[PDB]
Amino acid sequence: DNFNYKNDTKIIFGKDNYSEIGKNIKIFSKKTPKILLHYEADGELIKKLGIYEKVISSLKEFDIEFIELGGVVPNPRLSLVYEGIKICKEENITFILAVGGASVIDSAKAISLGAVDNGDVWDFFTAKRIPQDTLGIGVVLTIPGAGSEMSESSIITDENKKQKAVCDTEVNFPKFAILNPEVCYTIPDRLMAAGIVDILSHLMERYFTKSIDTALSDSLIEATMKIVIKYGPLLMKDRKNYNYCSQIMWAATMAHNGMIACGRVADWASHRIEHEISGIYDLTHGIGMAIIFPAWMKYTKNIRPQIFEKFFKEVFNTVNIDEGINKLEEFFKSLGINLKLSDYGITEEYFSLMAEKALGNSETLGRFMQLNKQDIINILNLAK
Amino acid sequence: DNFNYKNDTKIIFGKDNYSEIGKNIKIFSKKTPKILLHYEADGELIKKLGIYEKVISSLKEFDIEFIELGGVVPNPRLSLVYEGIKICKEENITFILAVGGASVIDSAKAISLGAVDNGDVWDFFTAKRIPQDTLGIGVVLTIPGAGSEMSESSIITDENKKQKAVCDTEVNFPKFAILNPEVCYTIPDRLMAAGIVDILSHLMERYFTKSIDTALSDSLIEATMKIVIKYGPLLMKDRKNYNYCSQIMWAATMAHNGMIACGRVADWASHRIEHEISGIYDLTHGIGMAIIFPAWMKYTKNIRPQIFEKFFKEVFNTVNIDEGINKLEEFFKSLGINLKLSDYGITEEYFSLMAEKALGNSETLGRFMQLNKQDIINILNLAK
Ligand SMILES: NC(=O)c1ccc[n+]([C@@H]2O[C@H](COP(=O)([O-])OP(=O)(O)OC[C@H]3O[C@@H](n4cnc5c(N)ncnc54)[C@H](O)[C@@H]3O)[C@@H](O)[C@H]2O)c1
Ligand SMILES: NC(=O)c1ccc[n+]([C@@H]2O[C@H](COP(=O)([O-])OP(=O)(O)OC[C@H]3O[C@@H](n4cnc5c(N)ncnc54)[C@H](O)[C@@H]3O)[C@@H](O)[C@H]2O)c1
Ligand SMILES: [Cl-]
Ligand SMILES: [Cl-]
Ligand SMILES: [Co+2]
Ligand SMILES: [Co+2]
Numbered sequence: 001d002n003f004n005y006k007n008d009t010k011i012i013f014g015k016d017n018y019s020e021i022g023k024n025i026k027i028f029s030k031k032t033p034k035i036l037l038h039y040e041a042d043g044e045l046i047k048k049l050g051i052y053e054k055v056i057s058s059l060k061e062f063d064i065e066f067i068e069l070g071g072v073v074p075n076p077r078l079s080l081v082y083e084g085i086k087i088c089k090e091e092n093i094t095f096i097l098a099v100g101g102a103s104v105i106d107s108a109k110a111i112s113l114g115a116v117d118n119g120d121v122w123d124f125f126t127a128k129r130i131p132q133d134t135l136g137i138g139v140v141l142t143i144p145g146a147g148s149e150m151s152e153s154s155i156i157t158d159e160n161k162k163q164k165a166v167c168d169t170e171v172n173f174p175k176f177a178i179l180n181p182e183v184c185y186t187i188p189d190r191l192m193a194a195g196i197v198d199i200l201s202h203l204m205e206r207y208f209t210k211s212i213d214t215a216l217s218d219s220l221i222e223a224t225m226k227i228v229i230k231y232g233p234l235l236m237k238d239r240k241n242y243n244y245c246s247q248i249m250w251a252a253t254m255a256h257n258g259m260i261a262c263g264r265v266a267d268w269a270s271h272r273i274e275h276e277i278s279g280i281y282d283l284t285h286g287i288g289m290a291i292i293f294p295a296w297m298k299y300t301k302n303i304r305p306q307i308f309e310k311f312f313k314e315v316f317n318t319v320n321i322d323e324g325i326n327k328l329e330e331f332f333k334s335l336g337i338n339l340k341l342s343d344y345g346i347t348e349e350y351f352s353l354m355a356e357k358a359l360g361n362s363e364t365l366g367r368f369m370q371l372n373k374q375d376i377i378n379i380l381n382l383a384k
Numbered sequence: 385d386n387f388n389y390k391n392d393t394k395i396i397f398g399k400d401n402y403s404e405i406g407k408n409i410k411i412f413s414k415k416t417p418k419i420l421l422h423y424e425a426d427g428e429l430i431k432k433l434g435i436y437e438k439v440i441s442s443l444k445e446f447d448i449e450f451i452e453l454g455g456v457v458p459n460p461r462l463s464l465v466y467e468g469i470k471i472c473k474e475e476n477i478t479f480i481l482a483v484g485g486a487s488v489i490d491s492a493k494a495i496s497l498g499a500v501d502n503g504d505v506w507d508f509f510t511a512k513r514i515p516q517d518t519l520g521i522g523v524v525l526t527i528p529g530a531g532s533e534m535s536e537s538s539i540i541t542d543e544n545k546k547q548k549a550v551c552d553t554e555v556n557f558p559k560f561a562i563l564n565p566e567v568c569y570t571i572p573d574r575l576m577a578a579g580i581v582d583i584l585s586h587l588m589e590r591y592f593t594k595s596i597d598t599a600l601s602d603s604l605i606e607a608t609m610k611i612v613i614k615y616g617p618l619l620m621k622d623r624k625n626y627n628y629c630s631q632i633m634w635a636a637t638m639a640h641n642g643m644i645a646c647g648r649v650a651d652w653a654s655h656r657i658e659h660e661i662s663g664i665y666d667l668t669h670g671i672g673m674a675i676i677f678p679a680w681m682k683y684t685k686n687i688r689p690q691i692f693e694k695f696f697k698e699v700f701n702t703v704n705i706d707e708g709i710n711k712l713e714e715f716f717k718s719l720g721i722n723l724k725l726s727d728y729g730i731t732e733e734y735f736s737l738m739a740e741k742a743l744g745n746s747e748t749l750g751r752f753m754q755l756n757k758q759d760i761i762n763i764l765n766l767a768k
Contacts, residue, residue, distance in 0.1 A: 002398025
């Protein structure tokens with residue numbers, strides 16, 4: 001097992017450092033800077049928090065001209081990205097500032113691409129052309145979600161065709177990303193808890209592998225996981241604790257690092273199964289990953305028991321799988337999450353439909369264990 | 385404690401992937417590529433190993449024209465860098481390939497700088513100008529030493545003035561670095577052992593800190609250390625074991641990462657003390673770090689016993705400092721290293737001189753503990 005790793009995104013970690021917005025705009029723009037401030041809706045919640053102010057005060061401090069463009073919505077649409085390209089060519093924008101989460105970061109990245117291209121940007125999403133340049137964006141992250149502030153990916157939906165797509169390319173890497181743990185404070189409980197589950201589950205999806213010779217990698221992923229297991233419950237009970245939020249934020253960041261996962265083989269079974277639950281019921285990703293992941297490890301405990309033994313020894317101080325699986329169930333409950341699907345009024349009614357749609361045009365799904373339609377129903381039964 | 389992190393060096397990790405030399409030259413050169421192959425002496429040992437061949441076979445495979453420039457020597461001299469600038473401007477070299485260790489990588493970086501500048505390169509080392517561009521280098525690392533294949537630093541000595549200096553700048557970052565663990569195999573024992581000590585000591589220098597709120601960081605540094613403690617002895621006894629060499633190489637790399645050390649405050653006391661031992665006697669850095677580090681932790685065990693308790697609990701499975709200090713002494717001996725200075729015929733004769741030269745024009749030295757001249761002699765007495 002060989003692997004490659006690049007990641008050029010500059011990370012500014014900490015608080016009381018709002019000048020680094022302006023400072024980093026200067027470090028990464030073309031000559032004199034004029035920037036596009038991108039946000040969701042009308043900076044409604046960004047401004048409520050006081051980010052909008054502390055942003056514009058950094059922009060002013062550095063004499064940076066700027067236009068605002070708003071209304072991105074959770075599933076960012078080409079409607080708006082096309083509008084954004086227009087503005088970055090007309091008003092000669094030299095840099096984009098994404099002030100939000102992945103929904104706005106993905107929009108920002110797609111604008112950054114189109115602003116430097118002499119074609120349609122959507123040729124970069126539908127596998128027609130491979131972009132070779134981007135204007136350049138900076139992010140101020142408002143919630144440590146899925147790491148788009150450090151990824152090479154942008155997910156956009158063409159609502160004219162109802163066809164959503166993604167574009168992975170080294171140019172999409174943000175030039176810099178401001179990461180202040182303080183943005184965690186105002187996040188509602190259920191969402192903080194679900195973000196904590198997403199961090200662990202991202203680590204676990206990569207940890208549980210058939211790959212061999214991954215000792216150091218194992219250690220690092222174990223280390224991050226343990227911290228999630230130790231601090232995430234403390235953060236839930238002391239929401240404004242900078243330390244607790246720092247560990248957790250730094251964990252999510254590290255979880256999106258492929259220095260700790262070194263070309264070891266990830267498994268997406270849980271993700272996919274959860275996707276289809278979430279596709280039919282109103283259920284937050286992180287919550288369904290806490291219901292499904294335990295069900296899946298029960299169902300897959302026989303593949304490489306040794307790597308399950310290891311997991312629970314290193315993370316929950318136990319060599320007994322059942323006990324460990326329960327310690328993880330308990331830990332999820334420690335974040336205020338109920339563990340069964342019945343609990344959310346999800347019934348067995350669509351376990352069949354959900355299993356079919358997970359598999360799509362395939363016979364099985366998974367890598368650690370090849371899971372067929374009935375295997376998936378069994379897992380949904382374990383989680384009911 | 386806030387911190388920043390960038391590192392743009394692409395890492396190609398693994399074996400049986402010699403085509404990625406050519407492939408990565410193509411990915412990072414100007415238009416058609418013509419490269420300078422940089423090595424130590426006359427590719428004497430690089431060629432003995434079979435790197436030279438597998439390099440030129442990748443260069444040919446990709447139709448890459450190339451000139452060779454040799455004779456870099458362990459303390460790379462401007463004599464040669466000036467020669468290299470000449471060649472990269474005359475022969476219009478678009479990229480440099482450093483095939484060696486830090487001595488040649490540092491030379492390569494200094495050539496890369498000068499080849500794009502309209503001045504003297506040495507203005508970049510003597511704090512006159514701050515370089516804003518470099519041609520671009522790739523490294524094939526022959527020994528996982530001090531990480532220059534991923535650093536922003538180049539250390540060159542002007543032998544006309546007997547004045548050596550360094551240049552830290554984001555442009556010095558190699559464009560890519562090939563890391564094949566197999567290069568470990570041929571390394572002599574004393575040097576492999578000393579490289580294993582350097583990895584741990586780089587982690588320890590950063591670990592033992594007065595900084596607070598560093599839990600995740602602690603975990604990661606602990607994780608890497610443990611692996612060094614576990615595999616390094618196995619590697620010493622099974623030199624050609626790819627797994628053992630992979631963990632250890634990946635540890636050194638990770639040790640040079642500031643994602644695991646997150647702006648926590650390093651201490652260089654041991655380094656400095658060792659420097660002066662090495663300045664007077666013929667002693668390999670790694671070996672004197674195994675004699676000195678234990679002496680220093682004995683002498684500094686009273687500062688934050690809690691972080692010593694933690695260290696030895698996480699790494700040596702013990703809460704007792706004395707026992708732990710001994711487990712670390714034992715571990716060093718497990719790499720075939722004798723632990724006293726007497727052992728190397730180093731006598732107390734110059735403990736005084738060595739202490740004075742460590743302190744230079746300062747009253748104390750260290751951050752974890754401020755060490756004065758007598759404190760340093762005491763530490764040298766602990767290590768005698
Ligand atoms: N690399 C990639 O491109 C990548 C990878 C995985 C997922 N994604 C995408 O990530 C998106 C999920 O985004 P996300 O989880 O970062 O969140 P988000 O910002 O898209 O939405 C988070 C929710 O919490 C609120 N919120 C955000 N920050 C807050 C704060 N500081 N205080 C209070 N409330 C706050 C928002 O109003 C919203 O309701 C999806 O579109 C998903 O497809 C992208
Ligand atoms: N970031 C930086 O720029 C930075 C930081 C710290 C130290 N340094 C510098 O690093 C240098 C030390 O270099 P290094 O430790 O990487 O080693 P090196 O390559 O300079 O020398 C290593 C020794 O082992 C031999 N060797 C190397 N690879 C071998 C292999 N595969 N098989 C057998 N023998 C092999 C060499 O012949 C030589 O005797 C010093 O000049 C030091 O100042 C630079
Ligand atoms: Cl997610
Ligand atoms: Cl070193
Ligand atoms: Co997931
Ligand atoms: Co050192």
